[PDB]
């Protein structure tokens, strides 16, 4: 509720949370405990004992669609809508000036995570538990923390998670990907006051609030921190950075101030992500800590991408709940609308409207591939009817199989834009998109009758659901 | 301002009215007049004798831009855009349960609108000049005039724009095209009270503000007459109607009042739309007029359809004035969003971005296909740089030819939605759109040196557009 500590306590009451004070290595060894414990439900683990560290390593917390939808203020993974209808509402706050005439963020002055501190000359990050996740890795990762940077000019702060390498005792790599976020801030910055120092601050073990703030998309009529407060009930606790001006949560575990020395980069080395492969090397920016500010008794937050399912994969899942009624607001049609993590959480998208008029799935289809910016890269989409599960692969199989012909009912789309790393596509940047409608074909789609569905009698679902648990068979 | 009268006097007085007190005819020669009024600017017309009636015809009152946006208290075809912004606003007006925790119409007793009554026995349609528009229609077509009716359980009405047919003395045919608006309230009310006639009313010169509140879509979070308030800056004056409950603007000119005979039908005979060609004939209900209320000196507000530009067509340009906010609110890329008369108001749109990434051009375009409903029939769509007049043929022609290659920049995909009466589809309700960007094509979309665009310098036109009107050209 109030910092990341009263998280892990309500999660171990629930038994959603398990202490491994078994000896771990975080070398790879912490990912496979935490794949094969996500990979069958499985609680947050917290091992306390890592081999040759004396911070506990936190992982696992969002492996699980429940404990995401907790981390929210809601203990449901159904009422993840409720924040898609409250995103919605925030983007349009007030009227214009014509037809006009008819949750700050409380700082504080002391925080815990600054109760210990150490900075420049001593800024040991071999001191905390950084793990590494696969063996053809470069070197340890930091997986978590929320990245805080400001503009040149805006008084506004972003935060963002990318993934930092450590290249030195108190050098990172800051991999901004996006051409957004602080990827953006810097670039700017550099204009603003060349050759002057970039200010960075990295927060580890932030409330579950922050945390899931800054992976849920907010509109820029509202700041990361200030939608936190919503989702929380209460506004959340910042607190003034040491070396610069930029604020981060006060209750969070462990923070890193520092810079970014403009035209500083360094090759960010091979790393598996989302995808399941491995990145191949880039450059990048570095991150220089100069200081290193934590709490007494401070766990290290970490995580780790890969073949999903994984652990951003099911944060995901649980993110797309939130964007259904965003969805359907602008498409009344829609009745379910669901990505898969084995499509690696964005790459297939499967959608079910209820069909009013021919040609119907193919307005869906184009209204995925534009509408929200989260969904532009999808390069497939299955369109099909109310009558059909989105989340059973039994299902959609078996409308793509029974209710489509591929040479009729398959559009595909050339030279859209896509991701810049999915090295299956033709051309970096550039590929090509399929969608697939396997919606029942009205006159006109078709001359043909179509077949006449097999539909369960709503009782007797309803009389064995109840009978059910009765039936031991399981 | 408050009515139909002062938005003449006004418009008289701003050189946009004029008044034929010559003998004109109703019959297809008050459209002849109209047509080259409108084909040259023209102001709004109002022939106060047309042979063989007693009541003035008002007509082409909307037929310049300019005017339209008066008639909706902004005086300024900009100030649409303001319009827009509020439509989109109004959509979201109240946040959720979950974190909520942080204009009436006003009915009149009197109205102008019933100082002159006449019902059942004589209720003489024959006395209204309405006017036939093309030498093949079939009869006489009411075509202003926003038709009344409410559901069968929901206490909100709805505003409908049908054009009607006169078959009798006292019967006009219902053309309800749409699957919404007063056609779901019949197909409802049948089924709530089957063979109970269904009640209906039209009310004829309105102030502008109903009438363009009946014309641009607004959210179903809203009440027509509520919107026509905003606009209007006042409430709007309703006044209960005689053989119904249904409420019409008091102010208006003239009110229809009647029923719809269940199962009664009628073949609307052909007749020219915006299209610029005959409808052919086909079967609609029937209304029955039991009563006729009108002012004291009542004027008749009509107009037409036909080959543009039309006067909805004009409508249409203003009207997506407003649209083009709601637009880039969804695509900030979004420069200026056109669509062209010529193409029939809604066949074909021009988009003009600023792209900032290889491919960026198919997603506006599946963006214009799938966004807003007013756009899902539009089968052409071309998109732009920002370096390119929308409105301007000899921009977009340009572009089209010097930055796209025909099969590589064309998108083609088949089988989506079409308008019942596009003829030129291969099956009625099914056809294809196109979508060609002309778009700078970035490296990755091309392999080659793309050209250095001729870019106007900004004091230049600056300088001789002060000097413009010093140098006497024209």
Redesign the interface.
Not at 88 to 92: M, P, S, V, W
Not at 94 to 99: R, V
């Given at each position: 509720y109030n910092d990341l500590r009263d998280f892990l306590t309500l999660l171990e009451q629930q038994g959603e949370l398990k202490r491994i004070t078994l000896p771990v290595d975080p070398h790879l060894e912490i990912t496979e405990i935490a794949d094969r414990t996500l990979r069958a439900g499985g609680p947050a683990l917290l091992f306390e004992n890592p081999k040759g560290y004396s911070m506990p390593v936190l992982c696992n917390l969002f492996g699980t669609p429940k404990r995401v939808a907790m981390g929210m203020g809601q203990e449901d993974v159904s009422?993840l809508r409720?924040?898609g209808?409250?995103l919605?509402?925030?983007?349009?706050p007030?009227?214009?000036?014509?037809?006009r005439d008819?949750?700050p963020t409380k700082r504080l002055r002391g925080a815990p995570c600054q109760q210990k501190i150490v900075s420049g000359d001593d800024v040991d990050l071999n001191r905390i538990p950084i793990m590494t996740c696969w063996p053809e890795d470069a070197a340890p990762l930091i997986t978590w923390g929320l990245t805080v940077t400001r503009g040149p000019h805006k008084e506004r702060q972003n935060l963002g998670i990318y993934r930092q390498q450590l290249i030195g005792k108190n050098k990172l790599i800051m991999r901004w990907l996006s051409?957004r976020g602080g990827a953006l801030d810097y670039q700017e910055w550099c204009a603003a006051h060349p050759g002057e120092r970039f200010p960075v601050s990295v927060a580890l073990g932030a409330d579950p609030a922050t945390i899931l703030g800054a992976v849920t998309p907010v509109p820029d009529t509202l700041s990361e921190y200030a939608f936190a407060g919503?989702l929380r009930g209460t506004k959340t606790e910042v607190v003034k950075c040491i070396s610069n001006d930029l604020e981060v949560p006060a209750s969070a575990e462990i923070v890193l101030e520092g810079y970014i020395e403009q035209g500083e980069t360094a090759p960010e080395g091979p790393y598996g992500d989302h995808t399941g492969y491995y990145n191949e090397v880039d450059s990048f920016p570095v991150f220089t800590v100069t200081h290193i500010t934590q709490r007494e008794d401070a766990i290290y937050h970490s995580t780790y991408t890969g073949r999903p399912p994984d652990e951003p994969a099911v944060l995901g899942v649980a993110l797309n709940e939130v964007f259904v009624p965003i969805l359907q607001?602008?498409?009344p049609e829609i009745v379910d609308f669901y990505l898969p993590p084995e499509g690696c959480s964005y790459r297939l998208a499967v959608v079910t409207i209820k069909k009013?008029?021919?040609?119907?799935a193919?307005?869906?289809?184009?209204?995925v591939?534009?509408?929200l910016r989260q969904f532009?890269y999808t390069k497939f989409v299955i369109v099909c009817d109310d009558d059909v599960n989105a989340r059973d692969w039994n299902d959609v199989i078996w409308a793509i199989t029974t209710r489509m012909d591929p040479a009729?009912?398959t559009?595909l789309?050339?030279?859209?834009?896509?991701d810049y790393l999915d090295f299956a596509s033709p051309?970096?940047?550039?590929?090509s998109k399929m969608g697939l409608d396997a919606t029942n074909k009205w006159p006109?789609?078709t001359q043909r009758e179509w077949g006449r569905p097999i539909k369960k009698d709503p009782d007797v679902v309803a009389h064995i659901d109840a009978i059910w648990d009765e039936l031991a068979i399981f």
């Open positions: 009422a409720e924040v209808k409250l919605a509402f925030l983007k349009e007030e009227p214009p000036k014509g037809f008819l949750m051409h919503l607001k602008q498409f009013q008029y021919a040609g119907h193919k307005r869906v289809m184009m209204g591939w534009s509408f532009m009729r009912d559009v789309v050339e030279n859209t834009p896509i051309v970096s940047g550039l590929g006109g789609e």
